[PDB]
Amino acid sequence: KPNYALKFTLAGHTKAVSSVKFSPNGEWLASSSADKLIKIWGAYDGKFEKTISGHKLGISDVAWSSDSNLLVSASDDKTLKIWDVSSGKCLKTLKGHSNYVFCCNFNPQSNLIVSGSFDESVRIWDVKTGKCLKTLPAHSDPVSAVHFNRDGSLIVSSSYDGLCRIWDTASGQCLKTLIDDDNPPVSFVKFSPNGKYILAATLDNTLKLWDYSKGKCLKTYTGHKNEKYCIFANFSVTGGKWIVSGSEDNLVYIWNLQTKEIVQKLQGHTDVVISTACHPTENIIASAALENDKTIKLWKSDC
Amino acid sequence: TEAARAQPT
């Protein structure tokens, strides 16, 4: 079992925090918020570094480029923005969605961005020009998450329509739809580090690990509360192999990936833990909470 | 203002 202990509390957003992400090089944490701002913090000391501004409405997601130099953000103002982190300047505004942009990610190559929106579509964008390269009629409800696999050759998308779908990045063709009985709303999805599985959250207090090519569900993680919000989950791989998720009972849950036992609950936030992130090289977790809290917390463990 | 992820279904 891990022994995550609270190390820092990062105050400063003036509304709910929506997403936190460590930079691929481990140096930084980026956070997004309903207060329309992105903030950058030191990953190891929690020190505030800068505020990044320009979205016209609140922001639901942020993600880093592979060289840790760019951010992309997804906003209720129906745009994404690409930012130079060092200068804080907006480099490109990606327009084309017709409703809130909810989720975003770069591919490992970081020449593409993928976005999902309340307009039920997934768009794929050229990082260098800002042009929209593909528009996918991906779902019949808001797209809650989009993620590239480890070589950028596939995209997974999830939606309130209850589906996860696997897309061929090059062709835009849908290669697999994952269904599960009554198909409750899928509120999060991401590929596993080895690209063979997907971890999907549904709004019935459940996380599932799927082999998407075999269509088999391999593990189920529960005990937390998730019926209303699109809460990020993670694979933690720097020490022991854990699953990490926020929860609507205001805790961070940590499960053993193989046994599905809850191995730790992290207490400190005073509102829904909407987002967690795992540091790329150290056993460090960042967690972020909604309106009655507005803070980010950094936790550190020996395994 | 507000962000869609910070609002409940």
Residue numbers in the entry:
A (entry chain A): 32 to 334
B (entry chain B): 10 to 18
What does the paper say about this structure?
PTENα/β, two variants of PTEN, play a key role in promoting tumor growth by interacting with WDR5 through their N-terminal extensions (NTEs). WDR5 performs its role by presenting H3K4 for methylation, through the recognition of the guanidyl group of H3R2 by utilizing its central channel of the β-propeller structure located at the top face.
To better understand how PTENα/β and WDR5 interact at the molecular level, we attempted to crystallize WDR5 in complex with the recombinant PTENα-NTE1–173 protein or the synthetic PTENα-NTE116–148 peptide and successfully solved the crystal structures of WDR5 bound and unbound by PTENα-NTE1–173. Initially, we attempted to co-crystallize the synthetic PTENα-NTE116–148 peptide with full-length WDR5 (amino acids 1–334), but only obtained the crystal structure of WDR5 in the PTENα-NTE peptide-free form at 1.8 Å resolution.
